[PDB]
Design a binder for this molecule. Structure first.
Ligand SMILES: O=Cc1ccc(O)cc1
Ligand SMILES: O=Cc1ccc(O)cc1
Ligand SMILES: O=Cc1ccc(O)cc1
Ligand SMILES: O=Cc1ccc(O)cc1
Ligand SMILES: O=Cc1ccc(O)cc1
Ligand SMILES: O=Cc1ccc(O)cc1
Ligand SMILES: O=Cc1ccc(O)cc1
Ligand SMILES: O=Cc1ccc(O)cc1
Lengths: 258, 262, 262, 258
């Protein structure tokens, strides 16, 4: 129906590998799909300790968008923390973006600080259970906290309904990550002209065991998307547990925003 | 008359360019059987942080395995399962840790011997499959001035020759985490041959399929003839990646190896 | 009838692409006179660790100066000496820290005003010296989507136009530590004009040479006419880098500024 | 007389800038001169915490030598710690090297560990006075110690006889550095075939106040150079205090090893 170019953006600690089932699904319907590793994620060669902000973390997306041929538009699909990558990119390249799709994701706004929905998530889900934390100082002196996600947290909260083959893959390639929360606290808010203006579709499930229903419904209330699609069942990783559902919603988004 | 059923500790070793991720389906399957499974990334592979140009030989590339074997508890032994190039990792390990190894399992793998140079099956492999299609090759000079050839495996070769029968989610995953690799063939060529007392003495099981489109039947059959395995299991069907296309067959064969040697 | 001789705290601000290193001869010369001297690297300049593509405006580029002025002890004031593009750093600083500034000294420098847009003297500079010879230009998109032009100054332009009369050890040093820079001219163009109460109110001394081969006599004389300095000192001879070709003349003029305003 | 291509290698914490007086001197005699910043040194964009060994630190030299046109040979001149960069490079590219020149430098050998002369230096000069130290963990878990050289140490020991303009420049551009001593302890010794075979000229002064006469004479005794030139007076930075003397010795080395 409309075929589109989708750019898929994994969350912190993960990599382009999280989209290994969704990328062929979309390509079966004629779409062009780009799945990117953000800095220090997946097989990106940088280590997290050399990344100094969330905007530097987003560099693979911003370079890609910088090079997109004149006149092409993409649909950026972001899971979990990647809603901050969509907002950073949309402020810089608003006219290359047909729409932002948030998949059980942070939905930033223009009214509060960039770290605001991170504050809210951590308030809703304050214990990362067996996750380990570490810190380093970034090049301007700020202390950055990194984490290594715990495998119990991975099995029960993130990959709740995923097959054993998928959970095992997650453990074999997961890397350290950081919210850069304090640097986000200090960041200028997202602009109305860029991020504020793009089309926004929010996909979620009430069976998510880490972005809990109440936080997700709060986000929607706080900055109402153009469209909200609720998938029944699945878990936090709907691109693994409800792959054909997400491919179908994404076809609707290509039909609507081309 | 008496049936023995054994649970074992398998250490799964991926081939160059790949990582521990290739075992993401066989590791749960083995654990369903009650076995202990360790799947290691070798240097500059999977999410190991080193880059391949910092590595100077196939022995250095094998460090995660040797370090692991160094740390095994006293009197604990493992079954090392190696795919494709990983039979050289099994030979390097067995020459340092022979008493920690219950058996070596070669899965569509290089089967080194003690009679010829370490690079001998690598040469015969390349003589049998000389066109790597869209693979790109690169060079770096190692710590003593040897030029090392690395490669980024091409995606058609990946689709058709390595992952022939794998699902699209599996082939897409490969493309998403595949890294550069090196056979270090010229440095293997100058390396001491594997020993009889270490590697020559371990039990050796050869699993293969004649539908493999990269380690071809004639090369695999030659390897078996060149250096007789203690046991050979030929899986019907599948492709080079039997741990993805025939996961349960492979897990069952590995139950039989544990019953015999672990 | 009464002679006043004053020791002062000078803060020396390099121009884009350069760093605190350009002041390596004037800083000892001033300290011989008993003054306190701070020479700061601005963002992405000298050995500051940020890269220029992480910087989004000339105000962000000025952060080391504003942070420094924020930390000055209560009732301490400094004389800010800025070379070439650094007169915009002096104007940005004076609009935040006017009471910490005894005087601004412009050394073959841009002389911003309050009447026109912040980018106005930048435009007139470029209109007067439009061919940057072998300079290479580059682009990046900043945090709100503006395209920022950066440059790597060419070595002939460096030899002949900026460092015309400098020794070879000095010109070689420049080539060894020179970094990319940006005028952020389009973002300066959208910026609020400098204020009368802050920048408009500071004392302003203009040091220049008519032998400057990049900020030419006609541009410098126009600046002086456009916005009358409190005092003008014209050094005979030298080149654009008077802190290297006329270090002692410059230190003596700066002693006179300290005597008058510090 | 013979004109040559010299590649100049600064020591840890410094950069190509330390050669700003020697490079024009040599170019006045017809030589081609390349002065390189090693990783995380001078204006190299890497931070020291992302460097994991002394061989990785040497990468600018090894890339340069990797690209040298076929048939060209260079004379590598190394000051202070840069004798370890000459030995690492010579093991990899022995045939591109006309000779190694050690300027008040570590002179490694093939008989003991790579860290051996570092052990010896630190035994001769155990107190770095106001130098500050720091540590980070490298990508394989080793703890690396870095330092920020103290300005008293800089003025009295390293830049003893340098002009005030030169000492001030040193303070304006000095960076953190590391000996990677423990990783050097673990490194295979330098080979006889590579490093062991190159021509070696040792330049020094007895007025050096940090590589003291007794350590320098020990080094010469421990691995006798092909030629030792002793400059009278000056300080540790003879390329600043005795620039024309060093340019003259280097002309002799081009005449002798071409
Ligand atoms: O989506 C991944 C994620 C990880 C850690 C957090 O703290 C928040 C989100
Ligand atoms: O609170 C920690 C956290 C970790 C991973 C997530 O995906 C979300 C939150
Ligand atoms: O087993 C993977 C492999 C890759 C490249 C080769 O040349 C040979 C084998
Ligand atoms: O000949 C190249 C080659 C590449 C990958 C393999 O797995 C085997 C051989
Ligand atoms: O003062 C340095 C300078 C560099 C580039 C310019 O375009 C203008 C000035
Ligand atoms: O026109 C470019 C230019 C470059 C460097 C300067 O210092 C001044 C102008
Ligand atoms: O030559 C610089 C140097 C710095 C620190 C050391 O510990 C040794 C050498
Ligand atoms: O002992 C520390 C040290 C520092 C700088 C040097 O140049 C030599 C040694």
């Amino acid at each position: 129906m409309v075929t589109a170019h989708f750019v898929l953006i994994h969350t912190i600690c993960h990599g382009a590998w999280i989209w290994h089932k969704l990328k062929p699904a979309l390509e079966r319907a004629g779409h062009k799909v780009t799945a990117l590793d953000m800095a220090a994620s997946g097989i990106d060669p940088r280590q997290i300790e050399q990344i100094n902000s969330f905007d530097e973390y987003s560099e693979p997306l911003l370079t890609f968008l910088e090079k997109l041929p004149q006149g092409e538009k993409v649909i950026i699909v972001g899971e979990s923390c990647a809603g901050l990558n969509i907002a950073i990119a949309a402020d810089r390249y608003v006219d290359k973006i047909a729409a932002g799709v948030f998949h059980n994701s942070l939905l930033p706004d223009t009214v509060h600080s960039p770290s605001y929905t991170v504050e809210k998530l951590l308030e809703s889900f304050p214990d990362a259970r067996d996750t380990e934390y570490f810190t380093f100082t970034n090049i301007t002196g700020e202390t950055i906290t990194t984490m290594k996600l715990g495998f119990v947290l991975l099995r029960e909260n993130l990959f709740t309904k995923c097959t054993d083959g998928e959970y095992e893959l997650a453990k074999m390639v997961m890397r350290k990550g950081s919210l850069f929360q304090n640097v986000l606290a200090q960041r200028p808010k997202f602009t109305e002209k860029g991020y504020g203006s793009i089309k926004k579709v929010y996909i979620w499930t009430d069976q998510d065991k880490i972005f809990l229903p109440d936080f997700q419904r709060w986000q929607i209330a706080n900055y109402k998307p153009d469209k909200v699609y609720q998938v029944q069942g699945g878990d936090h990783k709907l691109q693994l547990t409800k792959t054909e559902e997400v491919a179908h919603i994404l076809q609707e988004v290509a039909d609507a925003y081309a």
